[PDB]
C-alpha cells in the first residue's frame, strides 16, 4: 500500500488561509495564477517528510506576517497505518513541535521516514549546474532520508567539524588544544570514512538507476565519478579509508592552521555527472542538464521505493509548463501508480484524478 496524503489542514502557514483539505489517489493537479499560493501547499505537504522548508526557508518566514505562530497536520495511509497523524508546530519562540500519533518527537530528524514525498522542481537542475555544496546537501538528504544510521554520523561528523574549525582559531590564538585536536581528527576520521563508505554505496546505485532512465529518454550514457576525500576508489574496508583520513588530516595541519578551517574529509567532496563522457557541469547543453535533473529525481525516486518498501508520494512544483508533449507524456507516464501534487497555471494541459483551484489562498475543489 502506497503512502497517501489523505489530508491536510493549514493554519497561519505562509498565505493559505486556515484549512483543511482532502485529496485524492493519482493526480491531485492544483492550479492557480499564483505563485506563492501553489508551491505554498507543496512546501506545507514536504514540511512533514522532512521538518523543513524544501526552499531552503527559515521556520519565521513561514508564519503568515503579523501572527505568532504557524501549524501543520496531516494524515496519512502508508504500509503498516490506517491513518498516522503528522503535526509540526512552529511558535515564534523558536521552538518546533512535532508528533507523530501524539507522541513528541525528541528531534527534527526523527520526523524522517513517517511520510515520504519527492518533490520535483525546475530548480533540480542547479544541482546539475552549480557547485559541489549543491550536490553534497543534495546527496545529504537522499541518503537520511533512507538510512538513519548515515543521517546520525552526519549530524556527529558536522558537530565535530565545527568543534575543530573552532579550536583551531584557540590553538592560533593562545596555543595548547594539541589533545582535544587528536580526539577530533580521530572522530571525524571515524565518522568520515562510514559516510563515504555509504556515499559511495548510494552513487553506485544512482549511477545504474540514473543510466537507465537517461538511455530510455535520450538514448545517452550516464557516468557519476566520486572523488571521495580519502583519495581511495575501493571504500570497502572501512578501517583502511579511516586510516587514510588520519593522515591526511595530521599531514594538513600547517594549512589548516593558516586557514582556520578543516581541508580534508566529506565535507568538502563532490561527485561528478557526466554524459557522453563529458562533464555535465561544463559541457553539456542546457536540454542535456534539464533531462540530466529529471533523470535524477526518478532515481533518487525509485532508489527511496526500493529501500524503504514504501511507495513515496510525489509533488511536482511547477514542473509541467514549459515541457513539451513527448516529455510530458512520458513524464505523466511514470506517476502511474503514485499519489501526485501537480501545481500549474492551467486546468486544461494535464487532466488529473482530481482538480483544485486555488486563489487568494483557499483551496476549491474542482474549479
Same mark, same amino acid.
Given at each position: 500500500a502506497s503512502m497517501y496524503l489523505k489530508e491536510i489542514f493549514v493554519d497561519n502557514f505562509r498565505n493559505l488561509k486556515k484549512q483543511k483539505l482532502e485529496f485524492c489517489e493519482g493526480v491531485n493537479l492544483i492550479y492557480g495564477l499564483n505563485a506563492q499560493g501553489k508551491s505554498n501547499?507543496?512546501?506545507?505537504?514536504?514540511?512533514?517528510?522532512?521538518?523543513?522548508?524544501?526552499?531552503?526557508?527559515?521556520?519565521?518566514?513561514?508564519?503568515?506576517?503579523?501572527?505568532?505562530?504557524?501549524?501543520?497536520?496531516?494524515?496519512?495511509?502508508?504500509?503498516?497505518?490506517?491513518?498516522? @497523524?503528522?503535526? *509540526?508546530?512552529?511558535?515564534?519562540?523558536? $521552538? %518546533?513541535?512535532?508528533?507523530?500519533?501524539?507522541?513528541? !518527537? #525528541?528531534?527534527?530528524?526523527?520526523?524522517?521516514?513517517?511520510?515520504?514525498?519527492?518533490?520535483?522542481?525546475?530548480?533540480?537542475?542547479?544541482?546539475?549546474?552549480?557547485?559541489?555544496?549543491?550536490?553534497?546537501?543534495?546527496?545529504?538528504?537522499?541518503?537520511?532520508?533512507?538510512? @538513519?544510521?548515515? *543521517?546520525?554520523?552526519?549530524?556527529?561528523? $558536522? %558537530?565535530?567539524?565545527?568543534?575543530?574549525?573552532?579550536? !583551531? #582559531?584557540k590553538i592560533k590564538e593562545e596555543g595548547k588544544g594539541e589533545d582535544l585536536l587528536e580526539i577530533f581528527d580521530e572522530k571525524l576520521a571515524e565518522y568520515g570514512a562510514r559516510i563515504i563508505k555509504v556515499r559511495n554505496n548510494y552513487l553506485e546505485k544512482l549511477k545504474n538507476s540514473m543510466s537507465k532512465f537517461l538511455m530510455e529518454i535520450s538514448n545517452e550514457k550516464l557516468e557519476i565519478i566520486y572523488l571521495n576525500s580519502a583519495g581511495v576508489k575501493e571504500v570497502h574496508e572501512e578501517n583502511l579509508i579511516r586510516e587514510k583520513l588520519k593522515?591526511?588530516?595530521?599531514?594538513?595541519?600547517?594549512?589548516?592552521?593558516?586557514?582556520?578551517?578543516?581541508?580534508?574529509?566529506?565535507?568538502?567532496?563532490?561527485?561528478?555527472?557526466?554524459?557522453?563522457?563529458?562533464?555535465?557541469?561544463?559541457?553539456?547543453?542546457?536540454?542535456?542538464?534539464?533531462?540530466?535533473?529529471?533523470?535524477?529525481?526518478?532515481?533518487?525516486?525509485?532508489?527511496?521505493?526500493?529501500?524503504?518498501?514504501?511507495?513515496?508520494?510525489?509533488?511536482?512544483?511547477?514542473?509541467?509548463?514549459?515541457?513539451?508533449?513527448?516529455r510530458k507524456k512520458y513524464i505523466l507516464k511514470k506517476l502511474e501508480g503514485f499519489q501526485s501534487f501537480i501545481t500549474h497555471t492551467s486546468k486544461s494541459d494535464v487532466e488529473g484524478d482530481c482538480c483544485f483551484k486555488i486563489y487568494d489562498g483557499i483551496v476549491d475543489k474542482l474549479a
Open positions: 501547499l507543496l512546501e506545507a505537504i514536504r514540511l512533514l517528510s522532512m521538518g523543513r522548508s524544501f526552499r531552503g526557508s527559515k521556520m519565521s518566514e513561514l508564519v503568515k506576517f503579523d501572527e505568532e505562530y504557524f501549524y501543520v497536520r496531516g494524515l496519512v495511509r502508508s504500509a503498516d497505518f490506517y491513518e498516522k @497523524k503528522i503535526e *509540526f508546530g512552529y511558535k515564534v519562540n523558536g $521552538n %518546533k513541535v512535532i508528533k507523530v500519533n501524539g507522541n513528541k !518527537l #525528541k528531534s527534527t530528524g526523527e520526523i524522517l521516514g513517517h511520510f515520504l514525498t519527492v518533490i520535483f522542481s525546475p530548480e533540480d537542475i542547479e544541482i546539475i549546474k552549480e557547485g559541489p555544496s549543491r550536490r553534497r546537501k543534495y546527496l545529504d538528504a537522499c541518503i537520511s532520508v533512507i538510512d @538513519k544510521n548515515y *543521517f546520525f554520523d552526519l549530524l556527529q561528523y $558536522n %558537530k565535530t567539524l565545527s568543534n575543530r574549525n573552532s579550536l !583551531l #582559531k593522515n591526511r588530516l595530521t599531514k594538513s595541519l600547517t594549512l589548516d592552521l593558516k586557514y582556520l578551517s578543516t581541508q580534508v574529509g566529506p565535507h568538502r567532496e563532490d561527485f561528478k555527472i557526466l554524459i557522453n563522457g563529458y562533464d555535465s557541469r561544463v559541457y553539456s547543453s542546457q536540454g542535456q542538464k534539464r533531462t540530466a535533473a529529471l533523470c535524477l529525481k526518478l532515481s533518487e525516486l525509485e532508489i527511496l521505493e526500493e529501500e524503504t518498501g514504501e511507495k513515496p508520494v510525489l509533488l511536482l512544483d511547477d514542473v509541467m509548463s514549459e515541457l513539451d508533449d513527448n
